[PDB]
């Protein structure tokens, strides 16, 4: 009998004041929250943010919406959400969010006989995540999502995770292109501003960057160019043209690698770890060419000393490069 | 009792004329303003602007909304804000703004018995900041936000910072990777247009750019290449192939560095400090190649003159580069 359901719904909404929360002037309303993560698209280091799509479910109780005689849960058209009181939940660290609206407003209202309201949304949000890139690309990040009440302090509304640690689902299924999700954490607390104390829920993820791509792409070309730079020590010191060509062309190659790897890497202007490694490699090829300068200047009158300098360089340059690598890979890893 | 509150609010809104400001036709209405800065997400030299997220709070008194019998500050739903009078505040130098709207519109209305309205918004605004980049990357910027009344002159409305110099808070929440806030300032004044005189508030920040990245990434490669070009003066002048290769490849390396730095750095179409430094280094390596060309020309018939020119170059070039660096780093710092 649709007429009975229609008259029950009309009765519930007749005299209903949406401007007043449930139990207005009484104890606070407790709102439970669930999230189903569907994707995490682009963890950006240039803008320091990430995009997240989720099903955001809110649960509360409103006695004004309690109905009897209908042994069912009333799933209503989502437009009826405009005729009720819903919590003023907002994401405190979002930069641009929307609720999907194709083919209709991706929104769900389900009423239970006792007045329990389930309210669901499907939301894509860009959220800020400040990143410490001082160990890039060997870095680990922690990205959060903050959930708060914009208007109601703790005297009116309360938040909690529905299901405890089972509240947020779908995290294990996420597969980021450049990171891996190590652990996610749920926190409930209170936060005090000059306007009062508000409830806060916090969902955090810890991400570890994958390094094999950078090992194959960023470090090995520089290592190979540096190793190629030492070939100059095994050429005779009287061969000026060959050794100068080798040194200056290795310097040019190292410069090309640096200038075209700055563009590939994120354009956030401050120092990192890969920057230090590349500068070390540049200094090494520069020093090899300088060593040839010394040898060429000395060898005319003192051939034995020049041969000795070349023979010692053949050992000193690889040894010092190994020491530099040891210090670097112990300081950052 | 929900009914008494509902009828009180209905009475307050009944017979309320939204088209008229408080004390219409009488003394001006005074609006107090607070800003709580969530972040400064981006500063752009290409587009000459900056993005700012804030909590913007306005305070005023409307006697038509004074109510008695309920000794509570009524925190109403955000939708009720559509039924009242609010100041027509705008930002003169903003290009793109919005009020956050997930899950609901990030808006707050709170009322007090004496008719005092507290009205809060959460706003992301891109604001134009005209930057003098002639000293880039050693530059210091000043970025402002201008708050004005669009329709009401000084006869109708008056602005003030609520709390004096404590009106704007959260300045320490700003984390710009390449800048660093030096100082923020609050200003209150009036602005005259052909239509009349309007109140104006101004919030300004002073930004100091971080130089370390540019020293590691832009100045050291050029310095090392310029130094490398002096290796030619220590190579015997009979070695034409070696010295010619060194000179021309240093010129090519400098050209590659400059052309790739043009793409990597933000596109600011006029001459800055970094352009002057790079042009100076290019001139230096060009002069080194020219010196060798002269030496090679005259060395066949006047070996003494060629040797003297080499010996004097070995001192003149490092000394002149030191002087150029001294003048540059004293003028721009």
């Amino acid at each position, epitope marked *: 009998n649709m007429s009975f359901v229609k008259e029950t719904v009309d009765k519930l909404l007749k005299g209903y004041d949406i401007r007043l929360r449930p139990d207005f002037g009484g104890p606070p309303v407790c709102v439970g929250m669930n999230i189903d993560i569907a994707s995490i698209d682009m963890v950006s280091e240039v803008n320091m943010d990430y995009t997240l799509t989720m099903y955001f479910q809110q649960y509360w109780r409103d006695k004004r919406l309690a109905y009897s005689g209908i042994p069912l849960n009333l799933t209503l058209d989502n437009r009826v959400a405009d005729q009720l009181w819903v919590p003023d939940t907002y994401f*405190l*660290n979002d930069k641009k969010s929307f609720v999907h609206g194709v083919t209709v407003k991706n929104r769900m209202i389900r009423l239970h006989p006792d007045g329990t309201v389930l309210y669901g949304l499907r939301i894509t949000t860009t959220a800020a995540c*400040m990143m*410490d890139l001082r160990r890039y690309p060997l870095d680990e990040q*922690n990205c*959060t999502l*903050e959930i708060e009440s914009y208007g109601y302090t703790t005297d009116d509304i309360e938040f909690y995770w529905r299901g405890g640690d089972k509240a947020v689902t779908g995290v294990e299924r996420i597969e980021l292109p450049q990171f891996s999700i190590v652990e996610h954490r749920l926190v409930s607390r*209170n*936060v*005090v*501003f*000059a306007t009062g104390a*508000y409830p806060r829920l*916090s969902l955090s993820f810890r991400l570890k960057r994958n390094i094999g791509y950078f090992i194959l792409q960023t470090y090995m070309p520089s290592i190979l160019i540096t190793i190629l730079s030492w070939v100059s020590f095994w050429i005779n010191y009287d061969a000026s043209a060959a050794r100068v060509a080798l040194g200056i062309t290795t310097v040019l190659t190292m410069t090309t690698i640096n200038t075209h790897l700055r563009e590939t890497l994120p354009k956030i202007p401050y120092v990192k770890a890969i920057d230090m490694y590349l500068m070390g490699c540049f200094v090494f090829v520069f020093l090899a060419l300088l060593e040839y300068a010394f040898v060429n200047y000395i060898f005319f009158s003192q051939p034995a000393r020049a041969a000795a300098i070349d023979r010692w360089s053949r050992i000193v340059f690889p040894f010092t490069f190994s020491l530099f690598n040891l210090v670097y890979w112990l300081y950052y890893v | 009792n929900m009914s008494f509150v509902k009828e009180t609010v209905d009475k307050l809104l009944k017979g309320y004329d939204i088209r008229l400001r408080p004390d219409f036709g009488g003394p001006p209405v005074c609006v107090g303003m607070n800003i709580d800065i969530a972040s400064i997400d981006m500063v752009s030299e290409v587009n000459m602007d900056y993005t700012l997220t804030m909590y913007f709070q306005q305070y005023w008194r409307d006697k038509r909304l004074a109510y008695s019998g309920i000794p509570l500050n009524l925190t109403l739903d955000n939708r009720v804000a559509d039924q009242l009078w609010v100041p027509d505040t705008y930002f003169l130098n903003d290009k793109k703004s919005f009020v956050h709207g997930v899950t609901v519109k990030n808006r707050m209305i709170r009322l007090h018995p004496d008719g005092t309205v507290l009205y809060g918004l959460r706003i992301t605004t891109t604001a134009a900041c005209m930057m003098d980049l002639r000293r880039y990357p050693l530059d210091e910027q000043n970025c402002t936000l201008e708050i004005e009344s669009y329709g009401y002159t000084t006869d109708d409305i008056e602005f003030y910072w609520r709390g004096g110099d404590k009106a704007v*808070t959260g*300045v*320490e*929440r*700003i*984390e*710009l990777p390449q800048f*660093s*806030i030096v100082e923020h300032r609050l200003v209150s004044r009036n602005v005259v247009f052909a239509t009349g005189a309007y109140p104006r508030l101004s919030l300004s920040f002073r930004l100091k750019r971080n130089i370390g990245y540019f020293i590691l990434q832009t100045y050291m490669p050029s310095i090392l290449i310029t130094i490398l070009s002096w290796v030619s003066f220590w190579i015997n002048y009979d070695a034409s192939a070696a010295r010619v290769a060194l000179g021309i490849t240093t010129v090519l390396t400098m050209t590659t560095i400059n052309t790739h730095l043009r793409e990597t750095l933000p596109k600011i179409p006029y001459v800055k400090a970094i352009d002057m430094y790079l042009m100076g280094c290019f001139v230096f390596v060009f002069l080194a190649l020219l010196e060798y060309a002269f030496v090679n020309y005259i060395f066949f018939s006047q070996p003494a003159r060629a040797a003297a020119i080499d010996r004097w170059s070995r001192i003149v070039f490092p000394f002149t580069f030191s002087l150029f660096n001294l003048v540059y780093w004293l003028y721009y710092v």
Partner: nanobody
Amino acid sequence: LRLSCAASGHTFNYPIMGWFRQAPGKEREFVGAISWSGGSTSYADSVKDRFTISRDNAKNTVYLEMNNLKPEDTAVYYCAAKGRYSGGLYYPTNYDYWGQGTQVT
């Protein structure tokens, strides 16, 4: 007189350090706050021009120098760390990790 607060660990999730003082007959009072990174500083109204807060990130140290001490400063001092989205700056509840007490008279 001078105090120094040194922090170790995930000092990037807690970019703000704050000083508080506790009086026997009152509640805890905010004194000052310094950002680990940008170096911006905030002070209480009654400690301006007398106490000063600085920071050196080299050893992860934040310093509070105290000048012109007065008898109303007899309180046990604490240094605390505040998260990035933890709210207002003047409220001790917003601060997660607290240091040990210190008597100054």
